[PDB]
Amino acid sequence: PGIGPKTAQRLAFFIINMPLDEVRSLSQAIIEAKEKLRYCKICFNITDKEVCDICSDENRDHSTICVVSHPMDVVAMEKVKEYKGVYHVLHGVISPIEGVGPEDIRIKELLERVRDGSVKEVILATNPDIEGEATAMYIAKLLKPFGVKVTRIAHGIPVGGDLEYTDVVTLSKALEGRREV
Amino acid sequence: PGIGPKTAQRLAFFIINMPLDEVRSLSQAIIEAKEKLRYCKICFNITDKEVCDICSDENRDHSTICVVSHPMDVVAMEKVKEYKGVYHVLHGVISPIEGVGPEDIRIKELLERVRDGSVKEVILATNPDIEGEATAMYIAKLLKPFGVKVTRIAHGIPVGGDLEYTDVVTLSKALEGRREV
Ligand SMILES: [Zn+2]
Ligand SMILES: [Zn+2]
């Protein structure tokens, strides 16, 4: 079980409630996963190829990057179809409380992506909670010295909800409502 | 497959970052988990032995039973670090809406802990909503006859929320202030 402590506990709870046939399916799924899935060379989203079909799609706006904590959040933003840009998946947020610093989440590679002056906007779409907002805060500040417009998906997402389980209606609105700095 | 939206995500993360050899080990583990996993003979919490690791610790105050609806709920009362007693997991609540009665949750078991055996207090930690309250009431009505001091978690997730989703400080406080009867 090469798996983290709090996650093992969750699988245990899940597994005990699930029928035999699904347990088998999970165990097959896990193997399939291990060999089909990859991190994208470019956005670090979960995909099945070296480059995700969003990044490999030269019909998209590569000059606008949407930064999300997780792959699911790519999924949520892709239910608008109003967004034509590309993404960056952080794979976490900055959380002192869990010993996850900026060096442990994909911040350096976002930075490397702004080197070639090719990036025009970076939209920050982490959660409206404290770790979400603070991660946003840091990134804004890290990219300031460079030539890049940085915006923050507006309020429209409630107290502490998830960018990821938010309905296409309110997301669209918050993406349109982007504040600068 | 069988797995919650967030959990699936961290799982996939681990899979992608361990060696194939270990992923194969892991698949076998999942099925093995399903063979081993079980409800505690005493509290009905999720465990791999006949008796859970808390019911089996003799340090713990087996006289005070904290009554909870779900395993994750124990998990949350375990971030207390004041609480020293044992639990009972009901596995849900009396719920007129979903048609679940007293017979369908571990209430009887809770009584043949207080009847057969030596108990000095029951802390009712079901949720604060109608369902949680009715459950609590129903139990307190059934534990009247025996001596036991029966108290109730007071001042919980203002909502609307669940116990399993609350602050350590908040719980610590709600616990410190349990009132009878
Ligand atoms: Zn990509
Ligand atoms: Zn037990």
Author numbering:
A (entry chain A), B (entry chain D): 16 to 196
Quoted passage from the original study:
RecR is the most conserved protein in the RecFOR pathway; RecR binds to RecO, and RecO interacts with SSBs, then the complex facilitates RecA filament formation on ssDNA-binding protein (SSB)-coated ssDNA. At present, the HhH motif is thought to be required for binding DNA, the zinc finger motif plays a structural or DNA-binding role and the RecR Toprim domain is the binding site for both RecO and RecF.
Interestingly, TTERecR16-196 formed a dimer in solution as full-length TTERecR, but did not form a detectable complex with TTERecO in size-exclusion chromatography or SPR (KD = 24.6 µM). We resolved the crystal structure of TTERecR16-196 at 2.8 Å resolution using molecular replacement. The space group of TTERecR16-196 was P21212, and the packing of the molecules in the unit cell was significantly different to full-length TTERecR. Two TTERecR16-196 monomers exist in a back-to-back conformation in the asymmetric unit, and two monomers from different asymmetric units form the TTERecR16-196 dimer by their N-terminal interaction, with an interface area of about 5581 Å2. The most notable difference was that the interface area of the TTERecR N-N dimer had a negative potential, whereas the interface area of the TTERecR16-196 dimer had a positive potential. Superimposing the structures of TTERecR and TTERecR16-196, we found that helix α2 of TTERecR16-196 was 16° deviated to the helix α2 of TTERecR relatively, and helix α3 of TTERecR16-196 correspondingly moved 3 Å, and the zinc finger motif moved 5 Å towards the HhH motif. In the full-length TTERecR N-N dimer, the hydrophobic residues Val106, Phe109 and Ile110 of the loop with the HhH domain created a hydrophobic patch for the interaction with TTERecO; however, this hydrophobic patch was destroyed in the TTERecR16-196 mutant, preventing the binding with TTERecO. The helix α1 is essential for formation of the TTERecR N-N dimer and the TTERecOR complex, although helix α1 is located far away from the other three functional domains.
